[model samples]
Target: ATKAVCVLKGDGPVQGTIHFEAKGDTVVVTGSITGLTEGDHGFHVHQFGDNTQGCTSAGPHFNPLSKKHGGPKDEERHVGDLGNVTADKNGVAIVDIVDPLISLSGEYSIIGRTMVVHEKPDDLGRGGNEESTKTGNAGSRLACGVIGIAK
Candidate 1:
């Protein structure tokens, strides 16, 4: 089991929390996001945990094992980019994603990894920015958290 508490620095310091559970061959992620706008936000696993350097400092999404930068649904996917988490009007969201690229007992246990919440939707390339590069064309990074294993 693992848990993460994220402090967002956008409109303000929004507190985000996520709980991860590992079953046989699956990882279950469930959590809520608060203090955000009433809409969908980009939620993804970044490469580093150096938030002191700002979200951009975290560098690109976790692509340690791959080189694809599309959404979670993309056939060619980034090892770390899991797309966005849609926040309701009340600014709350729960999510679950399963991928063979990561694991609870592998090099990427998600623990110590970085997770970020963006201020805009990813647009899935409909925004006309650049296809196959960034999914949904999410604007900027809003808040972020570092995944840690619960003791």
Candidate 2:
């Protein structure tokens, strides 16, 4: 009951599948994405799973604790701030993240929400700009998908 997955797609050519499994105090996020731009991309979980308007209706990053936007390792950060995933020269991203803030169940669960990939890198609120402190200034959305438990 601690396993889940998300199938990602967007208006662009990006496509991926993210697998989640609860492991003790953390969750293991593993996935492979294609059609990237061979660079670091901002990855996060938006508050809503709505894919309308090319993911615009996905809302903002999941911030149930009302914390500031920061990296996954930061002590004070939104539950959705997952840092970055690097892409290779082939425009493919192989992701492997062990995150403590996200889970498959509970009040802070990311399930039923949206996982969004951004075109630019996330400054983790260090940009000092207004958008940085809010959304980490991660730039525009590239892809998104709703989280759902495995059947």
Candidate 3:
């Protein structure tokens, strides 16, 4: 299986590593993050891997499909939408999920993209706010890292 890795960086001690493995038609994502507020945080793939100007330089969610922001299981959602990550009292969060919309292959490949964690919980596009449909009203980005091929 082909894989990609991301070593995230951001404010505070917020840091982690995420591994993405391509298996058949899905990409299995697993990782752990630490040093966050004890609550839920939005997680997503961004369009660009560039962080020269910080996470904001990564641009918006990887929405090649031009779809609105929604939950991972939503019928119409951005390819980058992966939902939320919850942190424990110790400020640690674990992620383990399989996504069918992301790929490490041609065309829709996610390589060279950016992975980001937001400061607030994602409302899954049902929050009734305008940004909810555009960005899940997930608040500002907190951390980010580039997705790169594994040797």
Candidate 4:
């Protein structure tokens, strides 16, 4: 309702930073990563904010209605599964997605959730499986961040 804040967490020996501004139905997440290689990583909004257990604390994708997993651009996708963040050779990633399902006044708002970074890219069902309906081909947790309402 007011403003939003994103908290980037460190994983393994890697450190990350996040800066996000939520404007209506759109949230623009920008940040960089260090202490790793470069490639595609699964980026999504998790259901919880307890990163004390590392990535597991973030919980599964933020599927309020328990929807199927897909991409942010899919007709039917998980509320948390936004897709992959293509990192440059320096492991930096930036993403901006407009989500009507996740609004400041919607059911899947990011106000109290965590943004996770996976070590691998989400296959988006190209891997084949029903559970893939929940998490593409996402594998391994690398980094994570939490989203909070800002003043």
Candidate 4 residue lDDT tens string, 1-151: 6457665666475556655566656766556655545777777888998878877988898888766888877767777777887777766665555555555446667777887877788887556787566677677777777787766
TM-score of each model, in listed order: 0.81, 0.96, 0.97, 0.84
Which whole-number lDDT from 0 to 100 does residue 31 have in model 1?
A: 73
Error of 3 at 145 (Å): 0.3
lDDT tens string, model 1, 1-151? 4343344454355567766667566666677777777777777777787777777777677877666566766666676667778777777766666655555566766667777887787665445566437545666777777777765
Q: Which residue segments of model 3 deviate by more than 4 Å?
A: none
Q: What is the C-alpha RMSD of each candidate to the true structure, in Å?
A: 2.7, 0.9, 1.0, 2.2
lDDT of 3 by residue, 45-143 (tens): 999999898899999899998999999999789999999999899989998989999889876788999999989998989998888998888898888
**Which regions of candidate 2 deviate over 4 angstroms?**
none
Per-candidate clash tally: 4, 0, 0, 3
Position 32, candidate 3: lDDT? 96
Better of 3 and 4 by TM-score: 3
| Better model by TM-score: candidate 2 vs candidate 4 | 2
- Greater TM-score among 1 and 2 belongs to 2
Q: Which stretches of candidate 4 lie over 4 Å from their true place?
A: none
